[PDB]
Point group: C8
Chain length 30, copies 8
């Protein structure tokens, strides 16, 4: 359904935020 699919897109966007925060960790380590 389109609502569950839109919530899945929100989950994917939150995973992109997590990946960006991992990139911040890597930048701090350097």
């Amino acid at each position: 359904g389109e609502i569950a699919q839109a919530y899945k897109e929100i989950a994917k966007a939150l995973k992109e935020i997590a990946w960006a925060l991992k990139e911040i960790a890597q930048a701090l380590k350097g």
Copy 2:
């Protein structure tokens, strides 16, 4: 539908937050 479309706009906004966090990572790497 307008509700699923509004949730998709929330997902797009969350992706923009991820992009901004990546810009923070790049600024720290410099």
Copy 3:
């Protein structure tokens, strides 16, 4: 509808958060 319009306002507010995080990146670059 008023609910979809309120979700659109939440998306706009999340975009403002993304813009503020971009401003943080610019501040770190300086």
Copy 4:
């Protein structure tokens, strides 16, 4: 309606988070 109004209060709170992040940017620029 009370639900749409409550979602609008969530949007206003998210905008306050954006303003606070801008204050962080300004503190880093100083």
Copy 5:
């Protein structure tokens, strides 16, 4: 209603996050 009241509590909690981020800005300024 109890659902709108619970969303209002979420908005108040997001405002507390904004205030804490303002406290971070003040800490960086010092």
Copy 6:
């Protein structure tokens, strides 16, 4: 009701995020 109670638990968790951000502010002030 169980849904309003679950939303209240989300608000409490968001308040814990605010408290944690205040601990970050205090760590920067030291």
Copy 7:
């Protein structure tokens, strides 16, 4: 119910974010 249980899992995940932010505060204090 499965929806209230899923919202409870979201609250638990937000508490994990708060704990991680407390870990950041501890790292800054050191």
Copy 8:
């Protein structure tokens, strides 16, 4: 159900944000 499953994916994504924040803490401790 697909909606509860989508909310569980949002919780998992929020947990990934917590893990990423822990990686930030570890980078600061180094």
